[PDB]
Design a protein around this motif. Structure first.
Motif, PDB file in Angstrom:
ATOM      1  N   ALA A 408       0.846  -1.191   0.000  1.00  0.00           N
ATOM      2  CA  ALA A 408       0.000   0.000   0.000  1.00  0.00           C
ATOM      3  C   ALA A 408       0.871   1.226   0.000  1.00  0.00           C
ATOM      4  CB  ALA A 408      -0.924  -0.005   1.212  1.00  0.00           C
ATOM      5  N   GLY A 409       0.351   2.322  -0.539  1.00  0.00           N
ATOM      6  CA  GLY A 409       1.091   3.575  -0.655  1.00  0.00           C
ATOM      7  C   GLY A 409       1.331   4.385   0.609  1.00  0.00           C
ATOM      8  N   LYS A 427       3.372   9.211  -2.256  1.00  0.00           N
ATOM      9  CA  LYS A 427       2.860   7.856  -2.279  1.00  0.00           C
ATOM     10  C   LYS A 427       2.392   7.472  -3.676  1.00  0.00           C
ATOM     11  CE  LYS A 427      -0.758  10.370  -0.034  1.00  0.00           C
ATOM     12  NZ  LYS A 427      -0.217  11.489   0.778  1.00  0.00           N
ATOM     13  N   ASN A 428       2.628   6.216  -4.018  1.00  0.00           N
ATOM     14  CA  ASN A 428       2.065   5.568  -5.205  1.00  0.00           C
ATOM     15  C   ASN A 428       1.071   4.488  -4.768  1.00  0.00           C
ATOM     16  OD1 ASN A 428       5.319   5.899  -6.557  1.00  0.00           O
ATOM     17  ND2 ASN A 428       3.561   7.142  -7.044  1.00  0.00           N
ATOM     18  N   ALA A 429      -0.105   4.504  -5.365  1.00  0.00           N
ATOM     19  CA  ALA A 429      -1.083   3.423  -5.182  1.00  0.00           C
ATOM     20  C   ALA A 429      -0.521   2.069  -5.646  1.00  0.00           C
ATOM     21  CB  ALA A 429      -2.320   3.750  -5.973  1.00  0.00           C
ATOM     22  N   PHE A 430      -0.851   1.004  -4.941  1.00  0.00           N
ATOM     23  CA  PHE A 430      -0.567  -0.343  -5.408  1.00  0.00           C
ATOM     24  C   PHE A 430      -1.834  -1.024  -5.971  1.00  0.00           C
ATOM     25  CE2 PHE A 430       3.579  -1.547  -3.242  1.00  0.00           C
ATOM     26  CZ  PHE A 430       3.870  -0.285  -2.756  1.00  0.00           C
ATOM     27  N   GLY A 434      -4.741   2.542  -8.227  1.00  0.00           N
ATOM     28  CA  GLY A 434      -4.386   3.654  -9.102  1.00  0.00           C
ATOM     29  C   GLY A 434      -3.149   3.529  -9.934  1.00  0.00           C
ATOM     30  N   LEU A 435      -2.951   4.547 -10.772  1.00  0.00           N
ATOM     31  CA  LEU A 435      -1.766   4.679 -11.636  1.00  0.00           C
ATOM     32  C   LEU A 435      -1.487   6.137 -11.853  1.00  0.00           C
ATOM     33  CD1 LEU A 435      -2.649   2.266 -14.725  1.00  0.00           C
ATOM     34  CD2 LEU A 435      -1.025   1.851 -12.864  1.00  0.00           C
TER      35      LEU A 435
ATOM     36  N   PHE B 225      -4.006  -2.932 -16.679  1.00  0.00           N
ATOM     37  CA  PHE B 225      -3.825  -1.977 -15.576  1.00  0.00           C
ATOM     38  C   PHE B 225      -2.393  -2.008 -15.024  1.00  0.00           C
ATOM     39  CE2 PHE B 225      -4.834   0.504 -11.783  1.00  0.00           C
ATOM     40  CZ  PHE B 225      -5.644   1.476 -12.348  1.00  0.00           C
ATOM     41  N   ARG B 454       7.738   2.206  -6.462  1.00  0.00           N
ATOM     42  CA  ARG B 454       6.579   2.849  -5.900  1.00  0.00           C
ATOM     43  C   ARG B 454       7.039   3.485  -4.591  1.00  0.00           C
ATOM     44  NH1 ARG B 454       3.767  -1.970  -7.571  1.00  0.00           N
ATOM     45  NH2 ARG B 454       1.898  -1.515  -8.860  1.00  0.00           N
ATOM     46  N   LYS B 455       6.655   4.727  -4.402  1.00  0.00           N
ATOM     47  CA  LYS B 455       6.907   5.448  -3.173  1.00  0.00           C
ATOM     48  C   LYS B 455       5.880   5.057  -2.140  1.00  0.00           C
ATOM     49  CE  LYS B 455       8.353   9.253  -6.109  1.00  0.00           C
ATOM     50  NZ  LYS B 455       7.823  10.595  -6.533  1.00  0.00           N
ATOM     51  N   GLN B 456       6.348   4.838  -0.928  1.00  0.00           N
ATOM     52  CA  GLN B 456       5.509   4.520   0.231  1.00  0.00           C
ATOM     53  C   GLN B 456       5.770   5.536   1.303  1.00  0.00           C
ATOM     54  OE1 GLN B 456       6.683   0.481   1.530  1.00  0.00           O
ATOM     55  NE2 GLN B 456       4.537  -0.038   1.290  1.00  0.00           N
ATOM     56  N   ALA B 457       4.719   6.115   1.860  1.00  0.00           N
ATOM     57  CA  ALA B 457       4.857   7.030   3.000  1.00  0.00           C
ATOM     58  C   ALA B 457       4.408   6.325   4.292  1.00  0.00           C
ATOM     59  CB  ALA B 457       4.036   8.284   2.754  1.00  0.00           C
TER      60      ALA B 457
END
Lengths: 468, 472
Positions: A408-409, A427-430, A434-435, B225, B454-457
Motif C-alpha cells: 500500500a502507498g 505515495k504511489n497506489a498499489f 491507481g496509476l 492496468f 513505488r513510493k511509500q509514505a
C-alpha cells in the motif's frame, strides 16, 4: 437531456443540471485552449496573484459555498473542513510553485555541451471528480495544474454538483482565471466525452469506471492519473495501545459515514486482544449520532448516493447470510426521505464476504482475529486494492516492521487514516487502487508539465563522433 | 505433441538465414516469469550495494568475452565501428547507473506540519518489468531500461526483436557466471506475438519501436492496468538559421541523419534552411555525404552499414520513389540496392521537397536528407512543428540565444543547439516526448530509475494523547 439531482437528506429531486451536447463541450474546451496561452504567458507569479484573488472572492462568499455543499452532502462539520482544506491547498501550492517551476542550467559531463531545462504545461487537463468529497476532490489536482500553466475543465459528479455555483460566482471577479478554469455539469457520458477533448485526464472514482478511463486515455494516447478507491486495512498487534487504536480506527472507519477511498474497511486484531478491542470499539461507536433530524444533530451524515445505500445494504446481508454477527447498527434505513446507516461493528467475518473484499464506502467495521503476524500481513495483502493501511503496536519499530510488508502507498503507524487529514508524504497506489504517480510536491505539480532539455554546443571544433 | 515453433533469422549483410530462435509458448513464458518473481525477493533484499556488486561482476564477465559480444553484434547489425560504440556505451551505462542508484534509493525521515506526526519514506520496486526492444541498436536499446530497473530491485524479462537477437548469446553466457543475477534477468526470444504475450505477465512494460505497435502496447497495458513506458520514434527536424556556422551545421546534420544508416528514432529526417544560405548549405552537405563509404564488400570498408531489416528497405525505397514522383531532385545516393545479398542505401541529399511527400512526414529510418528552404523563422517553426512526432530537434544559429529563441517554440523533448542528435551521445537532460513519440516520463537521470519504484509514505504518531480530529 437534463438530469434531475436528488437531495441526500430529503430524497426529493431539487436541482437540475444540463449536460452539454458534444458540440458545446468541444466549444468550451477550445475556448479554454485559446485562453491557455495567455495564462501560461502570465508566468507563475501572475497565476498566483490570480488564484489568491479567486480565493479572496470564495472567502467573501463562503456562506454560499457552505450552503451548497451542505445541500450536496447532507452534512455540515466535514463541509467546513472541506472548505478549510481547499483554501489551505491554494495557499500551500502557491507557496511551492515558484521554486518547482524554476528552470535550471548546468554543465554536462562533456566539457563543450551545456544543458538548459524548461517545463511546458499540458494545454488542457480534464478532471472527473467524485461525489463523496465534492469540493476537495474536484480541486485537489485542479489547483496545481492551474499553477503549472494548464487550463482545466472540471466535471464534478452528477450526484453532487451544487457546490460549483458559488465557485462560478467567485470566478465572475477574476477574468484571467475564468477563461481557463471551466466547469462542466453532467453524468458518466459527459465524462467519457470530455476525455476526447483533453491532453491529460485525472479521474477519481470506482475501480470499474477508472479502468474504462484508463483504456480510453490509452486509445487517445494521453496520460491518465487515476485514483480508484481502497479497502484499507488496520492491523492491531498485541502490544498495541488499544485505547488510541479504537478511537483512531473508529474515526478512520466512520468519518464521512465511511464514504472515502481512505476509510478503514477491514480490521485485523491479534487473537490475545480481540475481545477487549471489539468490545471497546462498540462502546465508542454507540456514542456517535446521526445528523438527523437536523444537520447540527450529529457527526454522521446520510449516505449521499442511493446506489451506495444499496451496496452497503447488500454487504451487510451477504455478511449476515454467511454468519457474521452484528453488535451495533447494521441497518440501512430511510429517515426523512434520506438513506442512513449507523456505525456498525461486526465479527465472525472472513474473506468469503463482500464486506471484506469489495469497497463498501460505508460506516462498517468488520473485525477478524489473527493468530500470528504472518497471517495478519497475508490477510491485509489479500485484496485487489492498495491505497493505504494502518498498523498499531506498542512501539513504532515493531509496527514499521509489519508496515513494510504491506502492499500500500501510505501506512499510518499507531494511528489510522492519516492521509485523510494531512498532505505530506509521497505515495504511489498499489494494485488496482491507481496509476500515474503521486500528488505531493515536485512530482505532483510536475505531472502536469513536459520537461524539455536543451543541449548546447559551446565550442567551435568538430564533435569527436562526427565522420570528418 | 504440438510442433515447437522456430523463427529463422536473416543476416543483414548476406541476406541468408544463419540463426534460429525459439519463442516460448504462452504456458512456458508464464513459467519463466514466475521463476523470475520467486528470485526477485532475494534480489530486492540484497540491497542496492549488493546489486551494484553483482552488476559489476556481470560487467567483468562481459568484458572477459568482449570479442564474442562484438562478433555477435556485427552479425546482427552488419557494421563494426557503431558496434564498438554500442558496446562502450552499454558498459558506461552500467557504471553510471551503479553510481546514481544509492542516492536515488535512500529512505528519508522528516517532520511534518504536525508536531506529533513524523514521516518516513521508502521505495518498493515493481517485482517484474517487461522490456521489448528494437533491432536498430539491439544492445543499447535492450539495456537502456533494463539496467536501472535491475538496480531498483526489479527482475526484468527482456525480449529483443527477432530481427537482431544474436547479441543475447554472449550476454547470457556472461550472465550465467553471476549467480545472484541469473534468475532475475531473463532473456526471451520471439517476435511481436511473444511481446504481446509478455505484457500479460509483467507489472510494468517498456516498449521502444513503431508508433502503431506502441499504440497497441499502450492499449494492452491499460487493459492489464499496468504502467507503460513508451518511446515510439521520431521525425526529428533541424533548422539552420541565416547566422549559423555552416561548416559545423553540415557536419553535425550529416552525422545526425546517417549514423547507423539513419536507423534511429533520433535521426535527423527533415532539414529546414534559411533561403539565403540554402544553396551553399546543400552543396556543402552533398560534398561531405559523398565522402562516406558503404561497409561493402567488407565490414572494414566504410562507415555505412546495411539496412538491417528487409521491411525497412522496402519503406525507404517507397519514400524515395514517392518523393521523386512528387518532384524531388536527388543530388547523391537515392537507390536502395542489393549487394552481396544485403540491402543498402547511400547517404541521400534531396531538394525540391515538401510536406506532401512521405519522406517529410512518415518515419523513414534511412540515410535520407531532404532539404527545404524557408523565407522566415515563423515558417521554419511551423514546418518543424508540422508532424505527429515530437521526440527531438536541432537548431543552428550564430549564437546560442538566437537558436534558443527558436528552440523554445518547438514541440519536442530534447533540442540540440548548434549541434544535432546530441541525445544519441549523451544521457543527461530529462525530457518528455511530445505528441505520438511517447508516454511515461523520462528514462534519463533520476526519474529514469524512479519510474521503477513505488513510493511509500509512513506517517507516524509519536505521542500518546488523542488526535484532535477524533470523536474523543
Amino acid at each position: 437531456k437534463t438530469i434531475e439531482v436528488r437531495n441526500p437528506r430529503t430524497g426529493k429531486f431539487d436541482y437540475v443540471i444540463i449536460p452539454p451536447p458534444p458540440r458545446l463541450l468541444a466549444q468550451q474546451c477550445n475556448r479554454a485552449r485559446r485562453a491557455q496561452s495567455r495564462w501560461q504567458e502570465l508566468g507563475v507569479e501572475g497565476r498566483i496573484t490570480t488564484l489568491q484573488q479567486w480565493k479572496q472572492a470564495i472567502l467573501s462568499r463562503r456562506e454560499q459555498l457552505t450552503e451548497a455543499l451542505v445541500n450536496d452532502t447532507g452534512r455540515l462539520s466535514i463541509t467546513v473542513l472541506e472548505i478549510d482544506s481547499f483554501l489551505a491547498s491554494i495557499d500551500r501550492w502557491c507557496g511551492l510553485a515558484p521554486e518547482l517551476l524554476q528552470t535550471s542550467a548546468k554543465n554536462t559531463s562533456i566539457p563543450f555541451i551545456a544543458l538548459q531545462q524548461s517545463l511546458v504545461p499540458y494545454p488542457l487537463v480534464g478532471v472527473i471528480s467524485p461525489w463523496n468529497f465534492p469540493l476537495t476532490l474536484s480541486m485537489i489536482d485542479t489547483i496545481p495544474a492551474l499553477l503549472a500553466g494548464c487550463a482545466v475543465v472540471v466535471k464534478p459528479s452528477e450526484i453532487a454538483p451544487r457546490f460549483v455555483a458559488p465557485l462560478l460566482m467567485a470566478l465572475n471577479t477574476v477574468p484571467e482565471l475564468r477563461d481557463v478554469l471551466i466547469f462542466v455539469e453532467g453524468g458518466g457520458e459527459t465524462g467519457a466525452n470530455l476525455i476526447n477533448y483533453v491532453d491529460f485526464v485525472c479521474f477519481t472514482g470506482s475501480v470499474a469506471t477508472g479502468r474504462e478511463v484508463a483504456e480510453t486515455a490509452a486509445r487517445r494516447f494521453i496520460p491518465a492519473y487515476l485514483e480508484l478507491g481502497g479497502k484499507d486495512p488496520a492491523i492491531v498487534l498485541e502490544s498495541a495501545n488499544l485505547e488510541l487504536a479504537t478511537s483512531a480506527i473508529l474515526w478512520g472507519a466512520v468519518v464521512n459515514t465511511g464514504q472515502s477511498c481512505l476509510s478503514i474497511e477491514r480490521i485485523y486484531v491479534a487473537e490475545s486482544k480481540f475481545e477487549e478491542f471489539y468490545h471497546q470499539l462498540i462502546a465508542k461507536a454507540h456514542r456517535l449520532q446521526l445528523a438527523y433530524p437536523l444537520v447540527e444533530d450529529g457527526a454522521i451524515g446520510p449516505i449521499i448516493a442511493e446506489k451506495q445505500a444499496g451496496i452497503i445494504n447488500d454487504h451487510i446481508l451477504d455478511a449476515v447470510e454467511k454468519g457474521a454477527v452484528i453488535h451495533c447498527g447494521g441497518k440501512v434505513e430511510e429517515l426523512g426521505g434520506g438513506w442512513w446507516c449507523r456505525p456498525t461493528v461486526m465479527t465472525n467475518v472472513n474473506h468469503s464476504m463482500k464486506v471484506m473484499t469489495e469497497e463498501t464506502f460505508g460506516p462498517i467495521m468488520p473485525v477478524m482475529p489473527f493468530p500470528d503476524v504472518e497471517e495478519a500481513v497475508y490477510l491485509a495483502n489479500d485484496t485487489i486494492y492498495g491505497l493505504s493501511a494502518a498498523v498499531f503496536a506498542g512501539s513504532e519499530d515493531e509496527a514499521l516492521k509489519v508496515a513494510r510488508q504491506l502492499n500500500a502507498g501510505a501506512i499510518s503507524i499507531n494511528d489510522a487514516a492519516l492521509t485523510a487529514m494531512m498532505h505530506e508524504g509521497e505515495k504511489n497506489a498499489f494494485n488496482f487502487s491507481g496509476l500515474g504517480g503521486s500528488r505531493v510536491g515536485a512530482a505532483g505539480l510536475k505531472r502536469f508539465l513536459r520537461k524539455q532539455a536543451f543541449l548546447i554546443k559551446t565550442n567551435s571544433t568538430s564533435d569527436p563522433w562526427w565522420f570528418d
